Structure formats: C-alpha cells, structure tokens
From a paper:
Inside the sperm axoneme, a pair of microtubule singlets termed as central pair complex (CPC) are surrounded by 9 microtubule doublets (DMTs), forming a “9 + 2” architecture. The dynein motors are responsible for driving sperm movement and fine-tuning motility, while the MIPs provide the major stabilizing force for the DMT architecture. In this study, by using an integrative method of cryo-focused ion beam (cryo-FIB) milling, cryo-ET and STA, artificial intelligence (AI)-assisted modeling, and mass spectrometry (MS), we resolved the in-cell structure of mouse sperm axoneme DMT, achieving an overall resolution of 4.5–6.5 Å in 16 nm repeats and 6.5–7.5 Å in 48 nm repeats, and built the 16 nm and 48 nm repeat models. In addition to α- and β-tubulins, we identified and modeled 36 different kinds of MIPs in our intact mouse sperm DMT reconstruction.
Here, by in situ cryo-electron tomography, we solved the in-cell structure of mouse sperm DMT at 4.5–7.5 Å resolutions, and built its model with 36 kinds of MIPs in 48 nm periodicity. The A-tubule was resolved at an overall resolution of 4.5 Å with the local resolution up to 3.6 Å in DMTF16, and an overall resolution of ~6.5 Å in DMTF48. The B-tubule was resolved at an overall resolution of 6.5 Å in DMTF16 and 7.5 Å in DMTF48. We identified multiple copies of Tektin5 that reinforce Tektin bundle, and multiple MIPs with different periodicities that anchor the Tektin bundle to tubulin wall. The junction sites of Tektin5 filaments are dispersedly distributed in each 48 nm repeat but interleaved with the junction sites of Tektin1 to Tektin4 filaments, which may further stabilize the DMT architecture. The Tektin bundle is linked to the tubulin wall by several buffer proteins, like EFHC1/EFHC2, MNS1 and NME7 with different periodicities, to reinforce the stability of tubulin wall. However, in the DMT structure of mouse sperm axoneme, we observed that SPACA9 forms a pattern of 5-3-3-4-4-4 in each 48 nm repeat, and SPACA9s are located between the protofilaments B02 to B07, B02 to B05, and B02 to B06, respectively. In this dataset, the “9 + 2” architecture of the sperm axoneme is compressed along the electron illumination direction, possibly due to the surface tension applied to the sperm tail during blotting. By analyzing the cryo-EM maps of DMTW48 and DMTF48, in addition to the different widths, 432 Å for DMTW48 and 443 Å for DMTF48, we further found that the A-tubule in the deform specimen (DMTW48) shows a similar structure as that in the intact specimen (DMTF48), while the densities of B-tubule in the deformed one (DMTW48) are significantly averaged out. However, in the B-tubule, we observed a substantial loss of density in both the tubulin walls and MIPs within the DMTW48 map, including CFAP20, PACRG, SPACA9, and CFAP52.
Numbering used by the authors:
A (entry chain CH), B (entry chain DF): 1 to 427
C (entry chain G5): 251 to 400
D (entry chain H3): 210 to 240
E (entry chain DE): 1 to 438
Write the structure that this text describes.
Amino acid sequence: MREIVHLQAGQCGNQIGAKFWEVISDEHGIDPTGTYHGDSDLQLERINVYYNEATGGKYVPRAVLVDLEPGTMDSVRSGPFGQIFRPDNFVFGQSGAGNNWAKGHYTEGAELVDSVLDVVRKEAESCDCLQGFQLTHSLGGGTGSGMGTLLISKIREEYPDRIMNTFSVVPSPKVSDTVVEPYNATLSVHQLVENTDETYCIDNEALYDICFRTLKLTTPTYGDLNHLVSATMSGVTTCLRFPGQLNADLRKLAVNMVPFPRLHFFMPGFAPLTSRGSQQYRALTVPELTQQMFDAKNMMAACDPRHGRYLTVAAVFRGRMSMKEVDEQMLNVQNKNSSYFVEWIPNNVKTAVCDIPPRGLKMSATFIGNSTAIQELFKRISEQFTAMFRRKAFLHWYTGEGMDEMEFTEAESNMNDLVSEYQQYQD
Amino acid sequence: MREIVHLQAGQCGNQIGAKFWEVISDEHGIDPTGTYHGDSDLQLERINVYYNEATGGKYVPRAVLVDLEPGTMDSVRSGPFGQIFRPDNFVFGQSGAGNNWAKGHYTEGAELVDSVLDVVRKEAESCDCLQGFQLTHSLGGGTGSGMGTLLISKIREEYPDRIMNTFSVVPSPKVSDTVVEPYNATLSVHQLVENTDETYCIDNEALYDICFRTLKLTTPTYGDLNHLVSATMSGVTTCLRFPGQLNADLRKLAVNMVPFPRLHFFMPGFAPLTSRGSQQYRALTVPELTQQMFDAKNMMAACDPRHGRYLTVAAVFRGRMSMKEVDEQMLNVQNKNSSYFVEWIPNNVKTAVCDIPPRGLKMSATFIGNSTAIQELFKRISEQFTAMFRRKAFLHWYTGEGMDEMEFTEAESNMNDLVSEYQQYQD
Amino acid sequence: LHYFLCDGTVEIREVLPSNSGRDAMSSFLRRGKLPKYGPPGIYQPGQITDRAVLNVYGGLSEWRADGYLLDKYQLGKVEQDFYTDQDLSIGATINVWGRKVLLCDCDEFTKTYYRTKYGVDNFTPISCKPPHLPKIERKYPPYTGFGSEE
Amino acid sequence: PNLIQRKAISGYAGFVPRFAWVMGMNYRDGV
Amino acid sequence: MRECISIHVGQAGVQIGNACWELYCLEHGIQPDGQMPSDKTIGGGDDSFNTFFSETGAGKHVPRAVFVDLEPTVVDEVRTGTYRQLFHPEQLITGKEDAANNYARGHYTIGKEIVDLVLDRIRKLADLCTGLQGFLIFHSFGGGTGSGFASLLMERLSVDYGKKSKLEFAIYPAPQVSTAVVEPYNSILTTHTTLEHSDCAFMVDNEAIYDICRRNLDIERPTYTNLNRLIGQIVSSITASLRFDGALNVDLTEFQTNLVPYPRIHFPLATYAPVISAEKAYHEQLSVAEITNACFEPANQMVKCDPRHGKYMACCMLYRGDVVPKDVNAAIATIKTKRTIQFVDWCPTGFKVGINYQPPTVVPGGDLAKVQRAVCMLSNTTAIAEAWARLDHKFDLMYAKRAFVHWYVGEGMEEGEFSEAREDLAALEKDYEEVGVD
Ligand SMILES: Nc1nc2c(ncn2[C@@H]2O[C@H](COP(=O)(O)OP(=O)(O)OP(=O)(O)O)[C@@H](O)[C@H]2O)c(=O)[nH]1
Ligand SMILES: Nc1nc2c(ncn2[C@@H]2O[C@H](COP(=O)(O)OP(=O)(O)OP(=O)(O)O)[C@@H](O)[C@H]2O)c(=O)[nH]1
Ligand SMILES: Nc1nc2c(ncn2[C@@H]2O[C@H](COP(=O)(O)OP(=O)(O)OP(=O)(O)O)[C@@H](O)[C@H]2O)c(=O)[nH]1
C-alpha cells in the first residue's frame, strides 16, 4: 500500500509540523499520550498512509525533524505532542546557522546529510511503498532553504519515482526582516525549480489580512496562523485518507494540474472563513460556499490573480454534497468569468468531492490554484536582486565560504527565463 | 550427558565470570544463597549441562577460578554470588605478576600448572561426558595470556577430541595501557592460532561507543559493561540449554562456520539494543530486529567490516518466531548486498531459532560473524611489534627470564603468514 | 509543579537522576494553562479568542490598522474551565493533559500561603517513593565440632 | 568586620598589621 | 601476601617519614595509644594494616619500618612525640656520631659496625612477612648521613636479596641552591654507586614544591609540615593501590616492568595534579579533563625541566577517586592528538593508568583541598640530562682545583673513585641523547 513520509525543516518547518501534526492527532482523536481513543472506524482504516504502529496502541509519526538550535527542538519536544515525537527522529547540529544559506548548503550540511539520509532510509525501509514525500520549510528561511535544497537534491537520485511535495512559505513582500533573504531565496529557487515537482506558496500578510478580514480578532498567535495553513494541508491530504468517490492521488491531482514541466508553483484556497456572529448567521449552502470559495478576499496565497489570468484550477469539496450542485456551480462560475480563463484550454476546473466532513463542520472544501499571478512575485524579487547585486552588498561572507558571483548569474538568468516562461504562455 | 566446564582466567575474566555466572543465576531463578526457587521446568531440566547438584538444592557451578592476586579474588568472593563459588575451585599463587607474559608462562606457571590440572581432572571425573571447555580471559592480559597459553596447550593433548572454546578481549587500538602488551599479545596469539578452535574477539572502544549510542547513560560501570557482553555468550549457550527446533552443538555450528582450519577469530553480534524511551517507542517486529541486527553501529567486536567482506555469518534467534519471516529476511538481505559477500560461497547464512525468550524480553537474537575485517587488527599490531622490535625496547626483562628474540621471529612470521592467508582468501 | 500567581499558569519539570536513561530536557511542560479535564476537542481555531469586535470600517481607506467597532453582548464564549488555585491540597486527582496524577508534598511557602488563603493548617508529608526491603542476614553451615568449636 | 574581617579576600593587596611576629601558617588562620 | 618494608636514612629522611605514619594512621583511624575503639579489627594482624602495620596479638599497630640515623637529637625528639608508643624502640636505629656530610665516613668509618644490627632488624622483619614485594627507601642525595649510610646498606641488601624490588625516594639537589658545596661530591658518589644496583629511584625538588605553595595553595610562609604533608600524600597515593582496590589494580612490579626502558636509567618524575586550596575547591569544580591538563602543564612538575627541551618516554597516572574510563580514555585520546606533547616515536603507547575508587582524604590541621578525583602522574623524559649536565660543569670546576680533597684523603680515601664517577656520569649523558636521538 502507498504511504507518505514527512520532512520538517527550518525553524518554520519546526513551527508547522507541530501544528500540522497535532491537528491530525486531534482529527483522529489520539490523546497526547498516544493511546488511541477508538471512535471512528474510517479514521481507523487509513492511519498507515502517514503513521506507523508502536506497541501499546501507539501511532508513531513518520516524520523526520532537523534543525540546529536545540531550544527550538526543546520547545518542540516539550509541547503537547513531543512525546509522540521520537528522539530517534531528532537529528540536529552543534553549530548556529547564522541564518546563512551557504553555511546550511555547504558547510554544516556536509556532516549532517549523512545522518538524515540514514534516518530517512531507515524510515523508508520501515514502510513498504510510498506516494512520495512532503517538506515543510521556507524558501526565505536560511536553515530551511539550506538543508532543503540539499535534501531535495539528494532525495531525487535515490527515489526519482515518487512525490517531491514541497511546502514553503513566501517571505514578507514589504519587509523581509532578514536583509540577505532575497539572496537566500534566489539561490534556492534555482535548485527548487530543478528538483521539485509541486510547490506550495504561502504568505503571511495574506494571512494577516485574513486575520483582519474574517478572523476579526486583532491579536492572534503565529500558531493560530499555523492552524489556518495546517487545515489547508490537512484538507489536501484528507483526500487520500477518506472514502467517497473522489480521486485522491497527488499524481492524479498533479497530472490534471500541470500541462508543462516548469509549472510547480501553485496557490491554495480554503473553505468557510467565519466570523463571530456569522457561525449562527450562515446557511451553509454550496452556492454561498462557492461564492466564498472564489473570493479574491478569501484568497491567502500571494496577491490577487485579478492582475493576470487562470491557467488551471482544482477544488476538493469535503462533506455531504452531491455531483449536481458542484456541477452547476462550475456551470455558474464558468459563465461568470469565461474570458478570465485562457482560450488555450477550456473546462479547466478539476473537482473532487470528499463525503467525510471535518470534526466540527459539515460542508467544507479546499482549493488549489495555478493562475498567472506569480510574475509579480519573482518580478518583485528581481528588482531586489538586481539592485543589491548591482553593488554586491553583504557579499564578503559568501566569498569567505567559497561561493562566487558567477552562481548568482545563472540563478537570475534561470529566473528571468521563468519570467518569459510565465509571460510568454499567457501573454 | 553432554556438559561444559568453564575456566576463569586472567584478572579481566575475574570480572567477566563474576557477571557471567550471576547472569546465569538470575535467568534460572536461583537466590544468592543458592536455594533454587522452582519456577520453570525447562531451566530446571537443562541446568545440569553446566551445574552439578550438591546437598540441599544447591547447584555448584562447574568452573575453576585461577589468579595470583588474592584481593581481586577477595572482591569476587565477597561479591553477591561468591558463596556459590567453591573455595575448592579457588586456585592461585604466592607471587605478583609484574604484568609479565614470560613469568606466568615459564616461571609462575610451572608450580601452578600441576595443581590446576588436578582440579580440572577432578572436575572432569565429576562429570560424565563433556562437549568441551570454554575460557574467559584476555589476549593482552598479563597473567591471563600467561596462564591461558600454558593451559590451552596442556588441555590439547589430554582431551584432543572436545571443544576448546576461547573467549578473549582485544585491547583498545588507540591505547593499550600496558605498553609491552603488543609483546604480550603477539606472544599469546602465536600459540593461540596453534591450539584453539573457536575464539571471540571483543574490543571495549566499540563497546564504549555503544554506551554513547544506545545506552546513552554517560557514565557506566565496567560491570554493566560486563552486563553487555555477559548477554552475548549467554545467548549462544541458550541454544545449548534450551529446547526448540534449532540445533545446539557448537560442532553443528563450528563446521558451519569454519571453511579452513586457520579460521578461529570470530566476532559477536547482538539483537535489539534499546535506549531511553525506545522501549515504548519500538514495535517489536522481525524486520526491524533484522535491520538493527545487521547494523555496523550494532557491531561491537572490533571495527566496521564495511572495509572488507563477509565469509560466514550466523545469527541465532531467541523468542517466539517462525521459519518464514527469518527465511524472507535472509532473502531480503541476500538481494540487498549480494556483491558484499564473497562469490566463493553463496548462501553463506546459518540461522537457528530458539523458542524460549529471555527473562524480561521476548524478541531477541545473537550473531556470530567471520567476516574479512580482522585484517586491520593485526596490521595494527604488525607495525606496533616491528617498531618496538626495531630497537628491541623493554627486552631486558624477558632475557632475564630466559626469553630470546628468536621466539619473536616466528611469532610475527606466523602472524605475517596469517596476514596474507586472510588477505589471499578474500583478496 | 510551578503555579504562577501573576498569570494563573502552571509549569512542570522533571527530577530524573544520574543513569536514569532519560534525556537532559527539564521542562516537561509549557508554562501555559492546564484544562480541567483531558484533551479538549479543538474548538476550530479561528474563533478561540476573548474579545468580540463587531465591524471594521477601516478597509474603506488607510489611516490606522483599521477601525474596531466592538460589541455589547459577547456571545460565542465557549466554556474552558482551567486548573486554578482552588484545588490545591496534599492528596488529589489531576489529569494533566491525559496524566492521571496525585499530590503528596509542598515546598515552603504553600504552608503559609494555604493558611492565609482559606484557613487550612494540616500539612503532612506523604511518601511517593517506593518502599524499600532489607537484605535480611546471613546464616552459617551446620557444624559437627570436629576439633575446636571456633 | 563590615563584610568579612575574619578572612580578608586572599591576594589582599592592602596591608594588615601583625605582618611580623607570629607567622608560619596560611592566610585565613593568621588573620 | 601484599606487603613491603620501609627504610629511612639520615635525619633529613626522618621527619618526612614521621608525617607519613601520622598521615597513614589518619586514614586508618589509628589512635595514638596504639589500638582501635571497641570496633573489631584486631586479630592475627590481617586487615588494612597487614600491608602497613603489624597489629599482632598484643593489638598494637606496629609500622613495618626502620628509622636509621646517626645523630640522636631528632630521633630522640620524635621518640618524645605523640605516636612514640607505636614505634619500635630499636627499629629507631640511632647513632652517637655523624658522617660530617662525608660520603665515605658514613660509608666506611661508622657504617660497618651499625649495618650488622640493622641486618638483624631486616631479617627478623623478613621472617615475619610473607609477600615482601620490596622496600621503600626515603633518603637524599645531599645527605650528610643519608648519602653515605644508605649506600652501604643498599649494597648489602642487594647481594643477599636480589629477587625483590628496591624503591628509592630522595630529594634531588637544588639546581641553583646549594646549602653545602661538598654536595656535588657525595651526590655523584651516590649516583655512580647506585646506577648498577638501584631498581627505581624517584626524585623531587623543594624549590618547585615551595613554588606551588604560593602559586595555587597561596601560602607564602608554609613549613616542612606542609611539604612533608605533600610528599606524604604522594607516597600515600602510590600506596593506595596496596590498601584499597579499583577498576584495575596495579603493583610496583608493574611500575618497574612498565616504566624503565633499559638498564641504568630508572629515574622518572612524579606529579600530583589536584594541588589546590580549600576555598579554590570550594567554589570551583574538578574533573578529569582540567586535572589532566593540569598534570601535564610544564610549571606543575617539581623538577626544573622543560619537556619541550626533551621528549616523552613513559607516563604513569594513578586516577584515585570517583571516575569512569569514558572521559578518561577520551581525555587521554585528546592528549595523544596534541602536537605540543612530544613523545618519542619509539613508543606509540606510553600511558600506565591506575583507577582507585577511594576518594583521597584531607588531614586535620592540614591545608589541602577536598579532592574527589586525584592523580599521581609518573613520567620519564629526556629533558632530565640537563640536571646532571648542571652537576658536571659544577663538579669539573672544583675537581680541577681539587677543593676539600684534604678532608676526604685525610680520612683514608683516594682519587680513582672520584675519577670513575665522571665518566660514569659522562656515560649517563651520552646514553641520554643516544636514546634521545631517534
Ligand atoms: N517559529 C517561527 N518562525 C517564523 C515566524 N514568523 C516567521 N517565521 C519564519 O520562518 C522562517 C523559516 O525558518 P527556518 O528555515 O528554520 O530559518 P533559519 O534557516 O533557521 O534562519 P532564519 O530564516 O534567518 O531565521 C524564518 O526565516 C522566519 O522568517 C514565527 O512567528 N515563528
Ligand atoms: N578485570 C578487568 N580487566 C580489565 C579491565 N579493563 C581492562 N582490563 C584488561 O584485561 C586484561 C586481562 O586481565 P588479566 O589477564 O587477568 O591480567 P594479568 O595477567 O593478571 O596481568 P595484567 O594484564 O597486567 O593486569 C588486563 O590486562 C587489563 O588490561 C577492567 O575493567 N576489569
Ligand atoms: N629530607 C629532608 N631534607 C631536608 C629537610 N629540611 C631541609 N632539608 C635538606 O636536606 C638536606 C639534609 O642533608 P644532610 O644534612 O646531609 O642530612 P644527613 O646526612 O642525614 O646528616 P646531617 O648533616 O647531620 O643532617 C639539607 O641540605 C637540606 O637542604 C627535611 O625535613 N627533610
């Protein structure tokens, strides 16, 4: 049977797996101790897509955690579910990254790739047959970009036949906090576009806007935002676990999703975002869902695809729905914006229906999109790269590491090619 | 009936045995006083193979304890089980060793060999029909190698038809403490290769690593370190004492292990080694046993056979198993690393399954290995022996005792003979 | 345990000794709050807050971080009782996120603290470590006295 | 006394009386 | 079994011994009267004392030693001390006349009529003992009576007994300090005589012992009591293996068989790492690493020698206290990786480790620290030849102008023996670079 091994990298990958995993454990009803509390047979039939078995009714997660700063792990370990996490799974380092990509890609990665490869192959042999792997990290996160680029490059040759699912958060457009972050991102995306097959794109001001727009609660914790995106990651994975006539395999989703190889960067979409009075002011109907589904405000990925057009779109519906409402909703929306799609391909909606609602809500959904709205993202970073490479600011470090400006030349040359690549197909 | 009488030699074997017999005592359930508490019939059945009954429900261990220093022998008699050891079997000397090989081989041995031969033949007549003997000692041990080389020679002619099981520990490669130990080891091995049939090779450095790897308790005791190794030969002896569909005789085993006469050096291998929380974090399954069972980190004897190749391999399995999982595991490992074995012999695996698990754990196994990894050991001593012989350092003692360099000539020349022979067979 | 009177929160650490066969991490718990019972059903985060704003007039333009028009009724408050200072006495039952635990000793100030709080005074230590058994003694072989008795 | 006069912080560069007469011991005891 | 006999020549070597039985009686709890409390340790004399004392049926712990001196003043004074009832009267072999700092006078004029009596002492101690591993000799090179008198007795005990060990402990002559100008005279007379008979001669120098006092012990005005206490601790550490046990137990026979490379040279160096004050131990911590760094620090040896001017041959360390081999073998491994450390390529391994569980004890009225982990570091190196190099250029000057010869030639000596020592010495240096040259 086909299972999945998870990778959490970077200190946001450390953020995310914690919230991502507890939602899953809470979803299936396992206590923090590990003694599963049997209530649903359907969650009792597909735990081995993600979890292996331990003695005493314990479900061992098949995730490998890697970082450098122990206090992150100590917080991660001392959390609600660190006991369900393995000290076996805790691989780390003796140095501080300095949040330097070159360090994490050449210097400390050199002596840590051996450990993680042994850990993953031990875990790979622990399980039978894989769909693939997913990685939670950041493209602008220096440790996450450091190991991830190495790891995704490594996992390719041993297993070039599986899913290289990637989950990276796009840094803040207005202020990157880290000033060398644009340098870090440009380096990674060069290898990322080459090594990956699928990419998740996430931004926090969109989440911050969502926090303002519908959450309406002024001050959340970053974990609350982590819950929002973990729900997105849950929904896309609920497809594989749950029964109901919907085609779940990521390949099944991917081959319907990507017409040309260079398309890996895709944007999410989620299901009812509800404010304080509107939980009991809402008549949860597929129309008002579908209305809220295709809301540019309900978007959370990067920025409005209003600027561009829609290449491929795929939505999965979770709950007690039927084939007809989803069908007419497309028949509605398709006529609503017929021109906003590309004349290249018609009938670009990819629909799957999960009959198993989440715990606490009946009619939910998820959306994954590939529209012509990524240009400004790497166009934004293009001016940043050109300006700081114009006078090579903050460059003396990477030269001391052993890097050179030539690497930057092909890196931007590739990205500029992706600019035309995206521009030419739509425009 | 077919039985075994043990020999406790050298001051290390003094710790080796002390832990070794109490491991025998508690597994069978006898109190320290010696009054067995009847709990298991099978251990009650197969206790005669090593013990004799005296009056009052007391099993006398059938061994001989030999030393020169009273105090170490004082420590063990004052030990928790010194009462179960015989003042009759306590033989010793009035002299100090000087940690000198020659003194215990020609000077001190001469007046002690007579008495120890009397005691063992008294013990030999006490029993009916022995399979053979086993000896705990060290090759680099000052008096143990001194006494061992003499006794192994003498036991050859009296009973040339039995099992001359030998158990010796290899000193630490980084430091031998004793600096004339290379002389002591080289002197011993010259006669060891001549007389022995089976030899176990043990090194504390890898054992020191094991504490850092799975014991994870920072500061152990050498008795706990004995507790580690005491499990090893106990496992191979469980096959003899325990029932179940597996062949027990070492002759059944040794002929399966020894293709050519000069093969006496064999390495141990143990099964699940568990750490802080992995007891309740481990799902005990034959596959996960097997992988850890074949781990270079699980190797404890000398060094990594990664540098060399595998001549003969044998793992005995203790617990509630079946013939099919061990069969597929052998098929699995056969396909995994087929080139790493020698094309000389295919299907070089020998397996036995003991249906009687240990006391406390269910799934367990023990491994004996004869791989091509011993080369590095005796090249190390090769330059060690030559350099100190290149200017005959520390030699005036042995000339004073009556030893001459001509003895050293053939000892290394035969050692050089074993170098090529192990090399030639594999390379 | 470490209950904090400034935030009404608790913390848990471990006293594992040498050769314990356990990690060096001390704080087995966060410094947060302990729900009165086992794992609470996750209340669909997205409404797990305290205050209730009604409408935002901010998105109209950009002056501040938008306008916060509050409410007056504060509905949707879901009940989450927490382990407060009330249930503190030597000998009790507590479920710590799934840990059915007991209570047997207090440090130094709780004595003074508890007398002040309501009125309580009877504070006695309770053994939580396992009881110990001795090593009995030794006897000696029967003697026929063939010679001097000693 | 102040903080500690019984023993005064060895390496105590400032002088003390009784630098002569009864000597032949450690720092603290003589002080 | 496991016992030896201890010998003390010259009033220099007697106060240094007095402390050690004062010390040795402390860890054993020996009351000054001569008996234990109502607690039962007396018997046929077989307990912790059976290696050190002779607590026979009389119940009085009798030290297994003979003090030999030529001037009654000091030996009478200790005979009026506190433990005088313990000591055997005529084991305290006294004399009425001195050796006048003369090597030969104590070796010829008076030693003949006194050796017979002490020969009677040793045999009557030889018969009672059983294991008799060897002897413990405290003496001195610049000895007015220690030098000459020990030389003859060592010759006599060598010829009748050549199968057991002889441990020689002496204060080495101060390199730049000389309380007597005839000290080089008798000193080389000892060395050339002892080169072919002595088994293991270990040395120490008082100046560096004092240097330690005000460096880390912080004592600018110590006394003999503390120096005697320090060396008494040193011999206590080496004898701790005899009393207690450990992870491994080592004997002096191992020490001899594993330290000396070749005949003649048998002169290593001793060092004790945790030499610190009480308050320093109070607010700090001790572990194997720093003390291993401490014992190998060039300013901590009691001999004015720089190892970087020599090369290392042997190292014997006696870890006494609570310790595990893990950090020990790791720490010494780092020591092997060190580049400044200069062993000869002849020895890939040179480390003789002794583990003892018993924590070293403080002494009442003492100045040491509260030690849990301790080591005596026994090492031999090639940086030692400068000491005899200092001696010869010192000696060759006075010999050419033959000062004080009338004193020795007056009492019956001649020059040929003085002639022997110089090439006997010159043999000693030339060997040292020959073994020094790889
Ligand atoms: N844990 C945590 N991470 C955050 C938070 N907000 C943003 N992040 C981001 O998560 C990113 C990725 O984490 P890592 O890949 O582990 O970062 P790194 O390589 O260790 O180094 P830096 O990114 O420079 O901190 C960081 O760059 C942060 O910018 C937050 O609130 N909590
Ligand atoms: N008992 C014991 N032996 C150890 C230990 N560690 C290392 N050894 C070695 O095991 C060897 C075997 O001991 P023996 O053969 O009895 O030694 P011996 O002949 O009495 O003389 P030596 O080897 O010099 O002690 C010794 O040489 C030690 O070097 C330990 O912790 N306990
Ligand atoms: N061993 C020892 N030496 C000391 C002591 N105090 C000072 N010394 C030094 O040791 C030397 C003593 O040697 P000698 O004077 O020849 O002693 P002796 O041969 O027994 O005969 P005397 O000259 O009468 O003392 C002196 O030169 C001092 O420098 C001490 O307490 N013990």
